Amino acid sequence: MLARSGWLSLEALSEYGLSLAAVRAYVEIGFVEPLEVGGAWYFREEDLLRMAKAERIRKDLGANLIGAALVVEILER
Amino acid sequence: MLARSGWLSLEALSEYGLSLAAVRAYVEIGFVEPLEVGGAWYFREEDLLRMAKAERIRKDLGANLIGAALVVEILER
Amino acid sequence: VLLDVTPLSLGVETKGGVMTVLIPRNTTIPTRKCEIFTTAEHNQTAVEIHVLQGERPMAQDNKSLGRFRLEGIPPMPAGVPQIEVCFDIDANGILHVTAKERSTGREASITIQNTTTLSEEEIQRIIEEAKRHAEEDRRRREHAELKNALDSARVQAERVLQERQGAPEARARLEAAIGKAKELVERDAPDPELKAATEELLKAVEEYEKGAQAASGKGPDDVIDADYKPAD
Amino acid sequence: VLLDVTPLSLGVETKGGVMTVLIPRNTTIPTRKCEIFTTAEHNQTAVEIHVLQGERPMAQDNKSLGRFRLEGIPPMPAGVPQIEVCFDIDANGILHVTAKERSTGREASITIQNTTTLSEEEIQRIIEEAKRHAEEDRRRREHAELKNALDSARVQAERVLQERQGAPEARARLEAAIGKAKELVERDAPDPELKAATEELLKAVEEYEKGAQAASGKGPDDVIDADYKPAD
Amino acid sequence: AAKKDYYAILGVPRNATQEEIKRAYKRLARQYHPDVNKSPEAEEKFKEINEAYAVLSDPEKRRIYDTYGTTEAPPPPPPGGYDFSGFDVEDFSEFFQELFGPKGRDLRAELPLTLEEAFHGGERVVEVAGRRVSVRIPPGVREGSVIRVPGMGGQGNPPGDLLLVVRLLPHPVFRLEGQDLYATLDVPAPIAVVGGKVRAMTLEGPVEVAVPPRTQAGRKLRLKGKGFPGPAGRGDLYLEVRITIPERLTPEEEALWKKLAEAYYAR
Amino acid sequence: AAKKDYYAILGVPRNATQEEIKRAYKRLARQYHPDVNKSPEAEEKFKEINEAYAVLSDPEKRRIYDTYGTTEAPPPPPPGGYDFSGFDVEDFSEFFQELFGPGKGRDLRAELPLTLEEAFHGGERVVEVAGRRVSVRIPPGVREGSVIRVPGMGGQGNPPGDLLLVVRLLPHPVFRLEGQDLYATLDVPAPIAVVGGKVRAMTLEGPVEVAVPPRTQAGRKLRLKGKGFPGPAGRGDLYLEVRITIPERLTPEEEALWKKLAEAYYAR
């Protein structure tokens, strides 16, 4: 009698093709805010879609902060 | 009997505090179109104004494709 | 490289008899894994946790070795209370199930030992029977995620209704559809009806989320019906 | 170390008597620098080039070493033919002034030897007299750059008129401004008059680039002037 | 058909070398990228772009691939196979399919319809760019309805689905905003005294409509039983009235109107 | 005055340590950067957010500064001086002027809410910048995007900044002005389309009696030359539209004299 909505753990990242080191780099710069208490990080489904968009714009260039062009992009819509 | 409109030569670069290596790199990646004929390059005023905004976003982060964060932004205007 | 790799995918049952596997098969030991889980109703002070062994999505088709209850959960609106139902498989292979709570910290740990380990005959039996039934198991999956989508429409007509009192006609629509849900959960409807009801309730909440009052144009005082049919 | 650095900032004359330096002060030996300039009108084949020496903005007080002609500019709307003017202070120091026409290869390049290198007394004289005049020189620079704004307005009103046709009344206003420029550049008007005229021309070109024809609201067939004064 | 000038797509001259090609593709791909550009037209042009630099990259393929069309006839494929490393090549445009040949996408497009076609719906021979397709839209359709027809989208293995969003073309005299029609009911004055009948035009056609007496301007009238059916019900049409003057008059009308124009002068 | 919550500005709790501060600043600075946000309000927010990061940098400066507000009173300055390297701290908020003090001015851009009457008249006015004092005048005939630049009356600094006071033309309730034409509805009864009468129309000039030609069909515009809306390029006329209404109060005599043309409309 527990609803399965919650958040997404560090397990689905491999299914989404997102390395843990990249998630660390995104977290320490503020691209997305996880839920630490009480164990590992946790994210919403569309929270994992933002660096999923971000890690597809890395396929040409450049460094880690492409989320800057993404925060504007979601603000562009 | 000539009017001072022309373009910007390789002497106006120093007024805006631009390193010529960055100028060459951004020409080579295609953010701005040069005028090679017949010797050095020649640019427009707003070409050095786009780069002026783009290099103020280098003061924190990150690498050379801030044009991605700018080409969108001008396309958002 | 070590032996005793997990021969079962273990999780917790959810609404509609749907697994939430917290540790899949061919995973090593020891392993401490868990996630965030939420509640169903308002002020829900207790949560039932039923661990399951197997891979078929139906909880009914599964075998359950642990069915316990968690009281002491502080009364908070559904979705906000997050329950850490954490599975720890130690070196011996005991399934320490700890029901941690992020808010206060109530717990109810259960130990299920390795005496439930099934032999290669039964491992092949369950694997080849799930694979044998897979063609209808995907049909049951399309049934089950659609039933949970119906439950999601119910809980969106439940969360928002207590968060916003919309149009009384829209409220009557929501209540009639909720009665349809009550009559179609232990008397489940066919999938075409399920989709035509879930999308109908999606449109019902789309018109229920209208925002301001009845903006029938510029908001006139009153109207009248026109005698469209020929007369005189 | 090596010496005989260039002691003067050599450049070209521009429209209205404005200095455009091509080699600045303190340029190493040897050196070669250039920049592209443009034309003014339609169907122009003639190039007068007037090299000048100095630093202050005015031209009549500056000294010219060469006034030659490079011809053959394609008959073409203004601005496109980029006339390449190189000042080359070679390892000899001799100021080669080169004018190429990029289209066909029209070339007129005369040489201004190091005979125009001045003494220390005259360099000090020009520096100190420029600084002495500088307080009125920034005033006349506000004058001259505003005259260049008016000149750019003149060339803009010419280019637009030969490129796009607007309403006859706005065209009449632009032509009246053109006549004002004709009668108040050789006989320069004070600054505030020119500022009011340039902003007025900016407004006129703003209402001149309106796009389509005169749409008065919905664009009715005919309108009348209402007798706003009281009657009856 | 004929080779599209990829030099025109990228923005480089005919004899541009590798440098201009790279400076062009790193510019347009930064603008037409599917991740940074969310537009239905973007994906096809992005495929054209990646195909364009699939063959414009290296000097050896510049000799081999980029001379296509420059020869008197299309030369046969060179011996030794092709080298297409690092680029997605399996969904190129018609030119490369003609030349050599080597998950279906959710192709998103538009269905431009007026109010009448959208209301009736029915079958329609829809038009994708180049390929064949024909699917129907159920009646009562509105904006934002996702017409996802399986096996009908972009070619792929397996084939993709379609994302056909309705674009309501505004009818010249029927202005629909949301589910309400702001069609003005032009009517002479005498209806505000007794209440007459006017052959109004609505989505149901020309219909006689009567109005209650003494109705002021700006009033809305709800059309129940004759509105706009849809998924959530029949959206009634809220036409607004407008009072006008008879343009053509008679001397009898002038004589009769004189004595009340006097009253208007008085009050 | 009292401390504005920099934690609430960044979005972190009171006890949040350095890394949360870093991951909140690097998101706000990525959103409220003036280059990525070309808005007047973004610059002040950017200044305040980097000011928040200035006193939240390292654990020793954390202890020294972020105890302010926590302490029972703002303590006296610590000995040995400060360290504000790499930070433009010369335009901090009023709080830092209160606490420590040491600070070309900015061209402060703001908006003047002006109705049709106020925009038409302009005149002397007391403009309202955030916190400080200023007063400038508007010339009559102001239009959208007017650059009201007053040297030495804008941002504080050496030299002081200028003003960019953009006029927001307030929508007058019954005056719908688009460009320089007023689409003001002119409601009038029908009989003016038989002879042509007068209507007490209200315009920017005030209440004026307006004449109309006979047989005027509804929806027609009438030009107002000589009494329109004057501006910088001339007197922008106002094209008000006519509209036919019904006399709301009718008499039995009206019915008696109206029956004839009612029958006429019944026939034609």
CATH number of domain containing D28? 2.60.34.10
Beta strands across the sheet bearing C18-23: C18-23, C10-14, C47-53, C63-70
Task: Answer yes or no: do E16 and E42 share one domain.
Answer: yes
What is the Cα–Cα distance from F58 to A12, expressed in whole angstroms? 36
CB atoms within 10 A of CB C52: 25
Output Rg (C-alpha) for chain E, integer angstroms.
Answer: 31
What is the Cα–Cα distance from F204 to F229, expressed in whole angstroms? 7
With respect to residue C229, please indicate whether it lies within any of the assigned structural domains.
Answer: no
Task: Answer yes or no: do F120 and F75 share one domain.
Answer: no
* Structural domain harbouring F135: 108-169
Contact call for F23 and A29, based on CB within 8 A: yes
* Structural domain harbouring C59: 10-117
How deeply is E144 buried, as exposed, middle or buried, from its count of CB atoms within 10 A (0-12, 13-18, 19+)?
exposed
What is the Cα–Cα distance from C77 to C162, expressed in whole angstroms? 10
Question: Total structural domains in chain D?
Answer: 2
Render F222-239 in DSSP notation, one character per residue: EB--SSSEE-SSSEE---
DSSP state of C41: S
Task: Answer yes or no: do E32 and E63 share one domain.
Answer: yes
Task: Answer yes or no: do C30 and C94 share one domain.
Answer: yes
Total residue count of chain B as it appears in this document? 77
Within 8 A by CB and 6+ apart from E206, the residues are E199, E200
Resolution (angstroms) equals: 3.4
Task: Answer yes or no: do E83 and E117 share one domain.
Answer: no
What is the Cα–Cα distance from F120 to F141, expressed in whole angstroms? 5
CB atoms within 10 A of CB E104: 17
CB atoms within 10 A of CB C173: 21
Residues of C in contact with E211 (CB under 8 A): 226
Task: Answer yes or no: do D113 and D139 share one domain.
Answer: no
- For an interface test with B, give the residue of A31, A73, A75, A77 to mutate (most B CBs within 10 A): A73
Q: How wide is the angle at C-alpha C70 spanned by C-alphas C69 and C74, nearest 5°?
A: 145
Query: Sign (positive/negative) of CA torsion E212, E217, E222, E223?
Result: positive
What is the Cα–Cα distance from F119 to F247, expressed in whole angstroms? 36
When CB atoms are compared, the residue of F192, F254, F262 closest to E194 is F262
The region, left, alpha or beta by phi > 0 then psi within -120 to 50, assigned to residue C219 is left
Task: Answer yes or no: do D59 and D155 share one domain.
Answer: no
Task: Answer yes or no: do C86 and C147 share one domain.
Answer: no
With respect to residue D108, please indicate whether it lies within any of the assigned structural domains.
Answer: yes
List the one residue out of E147, E181, E178 whose CA is nearest residue E165. Answer: E147
Within 8 A by CB and 6+ apart from B30, the residues are E22, E23, E24, E25, E26, E27
Task: Answer yes or no: do E30 and E94 share one domain.
Answer: yes
- For an interface test with D, give the residue of F223, F235, F243 to mutate (most D CBs within 10 A): F223
CB atoms within 10 A of CB D109: 15
Separation in Å, CA of A70 to nearest CA in chain B: 8
Residues of B in contact with D18 (CB under 8 A): 4
List the one residue out of E244, E260, E242, E266 whose CA is nearest residue F261. Answer: E260
Task: Answer yes or no: do F76 and F18 share one domain.
Answer: yes
Task: Answer yes or no: do D113 and D138 share one domain.
Answer: no
- Tokens coding D177: 């401004």
How deeply is E81 buried, as exposed, middle or buried, from its count of CB atoms within 10 A (0-12, 13-18, 19+)?
exposed
Task: Answer yes or no: do D113 and D153 share one domain.
Answer: no
What is the Cα–Cα distance from F236 to F238, expressed in whole angstroms? 7
Task: Answer yes or no: do D72 and D144 share one domain.
Answer: no
Task: Name the B residues in 11-40 with CB < 8 Å from any E CB.
Answer: 27-31, 33
List the one residue out of E119, E154, E155 whose CA is nearest residue E137. Answer: E119
Task: Answer yes or no: do C17 and C102 share one domain.
Answer: yes
Contact between residue D102 and residue D84 where contact means Cβ atoms under 8 Å apart: yes
How deeply is E51 buried, as exposed, middle or buried, from its count of CB atoms within 10 A (0-12, 13-18, 19+)?
buried
Task: Report residue C13: phi and psi, to 5°.
Answer: -65, 145
Separation in Å, CA of E45 to nearest CA in chain A: 17
Q: Are strands F185-189 and F240-245 parallel, antiparallel or unpaired?
A: parallel
Within 8 A by CB and 6+ apart from F22, the residues are A28, A30
Separation in Å, CA of D184 to nearest CA in chain F: 21
What is the Cα–Cα distance from C52 to C221, expressed in whole angstroms? 61
The answer, for B11 touching chain D at a CB cutoff of 8 Å, is yes
Contact call for B65 and A64, based on CB within 8 A: no
Deposited experimental method:
cryo-EM
Question: Residue D72 is which amino acid?
Answer: G
Contact between residue D27 and residue D39 where contact means Cβ atoms under 8 Å apart: no
When CB atoms are compared, the residue of C220, C225, C232 closest to E219 is C220
Separation in Å, CA of B53 to nearest CA in chain A: 14
The distance of Cα B36 from the centroid of its chain, to the nearest Å, equals 14
When CB atoms are compared, the residue of B1, B6, B38 closest to D35 is B6
Contact call for D217 and F221, based on CB within 8 A: yes
What is the Cα–Cα distance from C160 to C163, expressed in whole angstroms? 5
Domain with residue E30: its CATH number is: 1.10.287.110
Task: Answer yes or no: do C84 and C45 share one domain.
Answer: yes
Task: Answer yes or no: do F79 and F124 share one domain.
Answer: no
- Tell me the CA distances in angstroms from E215 to F189, F217, F250, F262, one per residue in order: 14, 20, 12, 16
- Tokens coding D145: 């750059």
Contact between residue C54 and residue C63 where contact means Cβ atoms under 8 Å apart: yes
Q: Is-cis flag, bond preceding F252, omega within 30?
A: no
What is the Cα–Cα distance from D163 to D174, expressed in whole angstroms? 14
Task: Answer yes or no: do F66 and F148 share one domain.
Answer: no
Output Rg (C-alpha) for chain D, integer angstroms.
Answer: 24
Output Rg (C-alpha) for chain C, integer angstroms.
Answer: 24
Q: How wide is the angle at C-alpha E44 spanned by C-alphas E42 and E47, nearest 5°?
A: 105
Domain with residue E136: its CATH number is: 2.60.260.20
Within 8 A by CB and 6+ apart from C6, the residues are C23, C24, C25, C26, C27, C28, C29, C31, C89
- Tokens coding F103: 């600070």
Contact call for A3 and C34, based on CB within 8 A: no
What is the Cα–Cα distance from D96 to D114, expressed in whole angstroms? 10
For chain E, the farthest-separated pair of C-alpha atoms sits apart, in whole angstroms, at 102
List the one residue out of C42, C37, C38, C106 whose CA is nearest residue C75. Answer: C42
**DSSP reduced 3-state for C61:** coil
Total residue count of chain C as it appears in this document? 232
Residues of A in contact with C34 (CB under 8 A): 9, 39
What is the Cα–Cα distance from D15 to D38, expressed in whole angstroms? 11
List the one residue out of C54, C43, C45, C44 whose CA is nearest residue C18. Answer: C54
List the one residue out of F119, F226, F230 whose CA is nearest residue F172. Answer: F119
